[PDB]
Amino acid sequence: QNFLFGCELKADKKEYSFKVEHQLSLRTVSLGASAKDELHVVEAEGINYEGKTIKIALASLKPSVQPTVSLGGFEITPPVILRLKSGSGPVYVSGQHLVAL
Amino acid sequence: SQNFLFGCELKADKKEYSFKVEDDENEHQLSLRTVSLGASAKDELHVVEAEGINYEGKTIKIALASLKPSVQPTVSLGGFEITPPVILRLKSGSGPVYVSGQHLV
Amino acid sequence: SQNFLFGCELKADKKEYSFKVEDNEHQLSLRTVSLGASAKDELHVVEAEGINYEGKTIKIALASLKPSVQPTVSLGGFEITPPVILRLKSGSGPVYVSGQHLVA
Amino acid sequence: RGSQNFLFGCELKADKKEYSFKVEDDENEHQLSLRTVSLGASAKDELHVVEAEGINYEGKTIKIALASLKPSVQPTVSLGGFEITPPVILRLKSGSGPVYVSGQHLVA
Amino acid sequence: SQNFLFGCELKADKKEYSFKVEDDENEHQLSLRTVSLGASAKDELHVVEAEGINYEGKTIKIALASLKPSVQPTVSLGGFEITPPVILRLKSGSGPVYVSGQHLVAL
């Protein structure tokens, strides 16, 4: 089954934690109307193939250059934290929460 | 699997498009492909959002794209499949914005 | 399925391209829209015209491009059922549309 | 996914405008899946256009434009896996290059 | 199949990332998702290349992306799968450049 997913990362609330008791498929990352005209970096933190915790950079966005990046359905296994690493925000992430059996 | 074209135009006097379907004996999905700015759009940031129910039963609004005529007038979503009901809305910016995709049955 | 190249050129003088077939099932999968070297520095809008799920003919905007801002857009395999018209709603062109014609 | 995938790339430039992709009668179905087109560091600031030349479904050779790129506007376009059955020629239709094309050679 | 997060950072200090898998019996792929420029990247073209095997078993270098902070800071590759082993390399520019993606395992 396939549900809408989204989160907002901002100075207030730099992180979103995807957990639960499934797959997230990330679709776009985009800067809100009010973001400072500067580079924003959004990162994902989770476990790699070795079982080590890593931080990976998903996108670098700037309002006057590239305010949206489309990820094409980047599937991630829970758990993952999405975080605004730099830039004012707000930054949005959209995608799907997929459930199977 | 039938595949039909899908589109809508979001503009100042019509900021929403309601994808709802019903009394079908048939499963419906939309797969969004592009969001694009029309010619007369003000050169300012435009934001299009989707409003629908999440995995935990709560209506949410998610941002699909931020576009700007002089910077990035089209964004490709690559087949963002959404289950009905869903509202697409022009959250901010003037000028008309378009969404294109597919309506699968 | 098998896979063959698809393309067309749209410009102010040749604004429309009609995609039709007979036969096998056919689908057109669009991949890129791009602006040609000689296109004017202005917005070019490309649209598709074909049927919606209720049988009514609609027109949908595939892409807005401009040589000095975004000369190409990748559609990522936008599958369309024949027949469809592709049209240059605005802009000088030339604009190119590329993709696959899939046959099964 | 499924069958085997190998890396594919070529470079196109003013003095080397074409790359011809052909597969020998070996056994298997072969696909060339195009992933990216990007401009090299040295490329002049002008539009560069890359086209592909191959078979339509009527068996006739056609030329289609894959991407228009410019260093100071849009130096890379991801094609997301535009599969093409060999043979096909990739050509720098306009501009100086260098241009690179990347992708996968798929074998089943 | 399995899907794990993958990432690496390439910069003038460390221009290469080597993706190998310890021989096992299963199919691994590195599926590349995005390449993006870090906060301190200088404003010049950055070019990331991959070096790996072609269909004839010969090692080739192929350019994946060209990025520049004031024109195009991020490129999505949309799941460009490559069979190990592969080196990813900053073929020019300063970096930092980051690559994200998935390490896929099947069979």
From Swiss-Prot, chain B:
UniProt superkingdom: Eukaryota
Post-translational modification: Phosphorylated.
Compartments, as annotated in UniProt: Cytoplasm; Nucleus, Nucleoplasm; Nucleus, Nucleolus
Swiss-Prot/TrEMBL site (Interaction between pentamers) positions: 43, 68
Protein task: Acts as a chaperonin for the core histones H3, H2B and H4. Associated with nucleolar ribonucleoprotein structures and bind single-stranded nucleic acids. It may function in the assembly and/or transport of ribosome. May stimulate endonuclease activity on apurinic/apyrimidinic (AP) double-stranded DNA. May inhibit endonuclease activity on AP single-stranded RNA.
Subunit structure of this chain's protein: Decamer formed by two pentameric rings associated in a head-to-head fashion.
Homology family: Belongs to the nucleoplasmin family.
Protein name: Nucleophosmin
